[PDB]
Design a protein around this ligand. Structure first.
Ligand SMILES: [Cl-]
Lengths: 119, 119, 119
């Protein structure tokens, strides 16, 4: 496969099951577009953290982590930072200035799938 | 903004909502002091993991992660490792020898806020 | 102590408390074998994420993260990638091709225990 991207959204917004699936599917479509990967290689998650807070406030906030073996560059990080923030702002009503995004580049010797390392 | 510190505390202690907010605000104050950043830039969270266990035991345990673009030097890590452990021991009564802390230095091209990368 | 390994398992499978402890103890035993560390230094967790999805599907899926200061070499990562995937496939009946594993090598100055940095 080479690279299987992952995107975990953590948020103190109590997202309904439907809104969660909507956000994750739009994020999955964005990741497939930017990283040029089929849906079968993409992992996504939304994790509700009731106690999370930003800026000393309990208002809506999202912390997004994107992890991938390849495709972690300035061009992709710029595009995905833009796309993911807009998706969350529209689907779960978080304000844009209440969205963090973190990009992590993993070595192929550090990642495994089906019990085998990527190389 | 330069750097926006984050601190996520994971614990198998079923902490009450108020105790979680107190621990997070004391840790937020410690981060503001050591990393010299206003509260408006600091994120914190407490995450209850019922199944988490350490040393082959379910007794109280905390795994803390501190993530920041800057401020991840040995001098800051020593001070924050000391301060955070004392805060958790006092607020949720976890034993000091049952507290992990992990520090992560993030690249400004890998971090995003309000849809834009930091650097 | 030198190195204190950690293994978090995230899964959309709603695992019973007993099955969760069963899996974690088998993984803890695997980590002790490969990294040659006594159980008193090993952390493990299982985290149920109802919204997690892989390949555009909600079918059973596990994302495993292994974190340690030492023992993050190709030889250890191969053995643990194989062992952990078999453990999860047997205990919670996740398919092997629905299991990610990520390995992270930590610096000893970035890790702390009992308020003191390791390096
Ligand atoms: Cl809210």
């Amino acid at each position: 496969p080479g690279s299987m991207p992952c995107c975990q959204v953590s948020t103190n917004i109590n997202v309904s099951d439907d809104d969660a699936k909507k956000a994750l599917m739009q994020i999955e479509n964005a990741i497939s577009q930017v990283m040029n990967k089929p849906m079968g290689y993409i992992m996504s998650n939304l994790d509700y953290q009731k106690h999370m807070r930003f800026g000393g406030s309990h208002d809506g906030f999202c912390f997004v982590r994107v992890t991938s073996i390849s495709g972690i560059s300035r061009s992709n990080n710029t595009a995905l930072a833009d796309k993911i923030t807009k998706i969350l702002a529209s689907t779960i009503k978080v304000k844009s200035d209440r969205v963090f995004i973190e990009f992590k580049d993993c070595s192929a010797q550090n990642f495994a799938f089906n019990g085998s390392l990527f190389g």
